[PDB]
Amino acid sequence: GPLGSQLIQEFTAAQRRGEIGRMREVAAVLLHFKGYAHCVDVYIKQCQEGAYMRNDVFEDIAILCQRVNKQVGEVFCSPETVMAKLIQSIFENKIQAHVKERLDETRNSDVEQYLKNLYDLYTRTTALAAKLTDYNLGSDKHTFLSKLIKNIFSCYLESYIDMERQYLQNRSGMILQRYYDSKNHQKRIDTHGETLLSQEVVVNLLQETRHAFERCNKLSDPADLPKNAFSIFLILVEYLCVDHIDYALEIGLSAIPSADAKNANLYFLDVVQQANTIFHLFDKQFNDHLMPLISSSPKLTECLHKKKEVIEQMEVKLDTGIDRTLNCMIGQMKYILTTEQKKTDFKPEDENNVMIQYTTACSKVCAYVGKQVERVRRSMDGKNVDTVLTELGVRFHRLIHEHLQQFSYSSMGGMLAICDVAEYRRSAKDFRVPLVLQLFDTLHALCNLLVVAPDNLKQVCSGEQLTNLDRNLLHAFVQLRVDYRSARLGRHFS
Ligand SMILES: [Br-]
Ligand SMILES: [Br-]
Ligand SMILES: [Br-]
Ligand SMILES: [Br-]
Ligand SMILES: [Br-]
Ligand SMILES: [Br-]
Ligand SMILES: [Br-]
Ligand SMILES: [Br-]
Ligand SMILES: [Br-]
Ligand SMILES: [Br-]
């Protein structure tokens, strides 16, 4: 019939000014007809008009819902259905308008600020939805809020991961270019030991990626959180690893003079030092930040495999470079020995007038060794420096060991050999590595063989420093004696 439902305008008047049960009476009448849905509707519009006048909209709607809750119980019979209508109106209108307002402007002017706003707006909305769930709305309310948040973020959170990666690729690219421009280095003799490894570029790349993970944690669907957080990681290993540090490792690998003369190749040891600190900053953000997001991954086993693979590819290159730098040093110590150690040193031309000291070949080497050891300590941190010295010291002991075996020794030449080793031992003591010192300790005892009289030869072999050594090793040194044939020293087949 002629619905004079425009007594709904009588309800509007009652709400305008004055607190009354007149709102209740008109509402109680209106539930008898279709139009009770419209009455509560205009009630929501009116109480919202004077509300939004604050800098913070999420506090404004929090105060709005509390004052409406105490009033709605006075006016309507089923406050729970009215209340759900309220917050739905707040979300579908006010919240969605405030989100579209913040994002449209910054979307085509500041992509990073867009991501930081989308993250902030989504966080405050969820925190707000947790405040609204405290009210006695119709249970299953949790699903109700979830649909409201989804209906105003579904398309923002859909194209999220693509904008996040497009941003990170571009921002990382700009950081790398800005660094290679400040060094006047176009991609693909340099006297400077330029490592091309910035501890600023890496820490700024990690700064950027860390923040991307945090946004990824809350803005990515939990079912796709692992695959999304790993997509971001692959961007890091493409710019930080492949493009920055792996590039500087190959560039630094070509500045090695290849075991020749005149080598100012302190360069690569500086590269090893920086790369190690970079690695410590790398896996630190990996364990603390990326791992909590990837822990629940279907194929986490393949995620850890690529992380390991990447960090081993460059681990090997560092091991190739430390090896090439070491035999460059061994190459020079060998050069000193061949050109400055003659036969007449251990096989003196005239037995009569010989002053026994360590050879000039010995001092030239020890002086060189010490000059390089110093450069190693000054170019590396305490942890990885002892592993390098150990290798150098082992190779150092190896060189002298085989060097001593290509000479014949007279009675007089014997002492000169010990004097050499004794000085070599002091040079090795400067390594501060027990292994190197102990290796020359056995070589020192070994030289004792080509000095003692033939009758006390098998006696000395029974000594504490020699007994626990292989008989073949004792034999190799006895053969170096000039009177190995002149005496019955062939009794070393036992
Ligand atoms: Br009115
Ligand atoms: Br209703
Ligand atoms: Br952020
Ligand atoms: Br959240
Ligand atoms: Br409930
Ligand atoms: Br930078
Ligand atoms: Br990439
Ligand atoms: Br280091
Ligand atoms: Br980090
Ligand atoms: Br001496």
Numbering used by the authors: -4 to 0, 195 to 377, 403 to 708
Quote the authors verbatim.
In the initial step of the fusion, it has been postulated that the vesicles and the plasma membrane are physically and reversibly connected through a heterooctameric protein complex termed the exocyst complex. The exocyst complex consists of Sec3, Sec5, Sec6, Sec8, Sec10, Sec15, Exo70 and Exo84. Sec10 appears to serve as a central hub for bridging these two assembly modules, possibly through its interaction with Sec6 and/or Sec82324. In this study, we report the near-full-length structure of zebrafish Sec10 (zSec10).
Among the expression constructs tested in this study, we obtained clusters of daggerlike small crystals from zSec10195–708 (Δ385–394). Bromide soaking improved the diffraction from ~4 Å to 3 Å or higher. The structure of zSec10195–708 (Δ385–394) was determined by a single-wavelength anomalous dispersion (SAD) method and refined to 2.73 Å. Residues 378–384 and 395–402 were invisible, probably owing to the structural disorder. The final refined model includes 10 bromide atoms and 2 water molecules. zSec10 folds into an elongated rod with dimensions of 150 Å × 40 Å × 25 Å. The structure of zSec10 can be divided into five domains A–E, each of which is composed of an antiparallel helix bundle. Helix H7 is shared between domains B and C, whereas helix H11 is shared between domains C and D. These two long helices serve as the bridge connecting two adjoining subdomains. In contrast, zSec10 shows no substantial charge polarity on its surface, but several negatively or positively charged pockets were observed in its C-terminal half. The corresponding region of zSec10 forms a cave with negative charges, which are derived primarily from acidic residues on the loop connecting domains C and D. This cave could electrostatically interact with the conserved lysine residues (i.e., Lys3, Lys7 and Lys12) of Arf6 in the N-terminal region, which is required for the interaction with Sec1027.
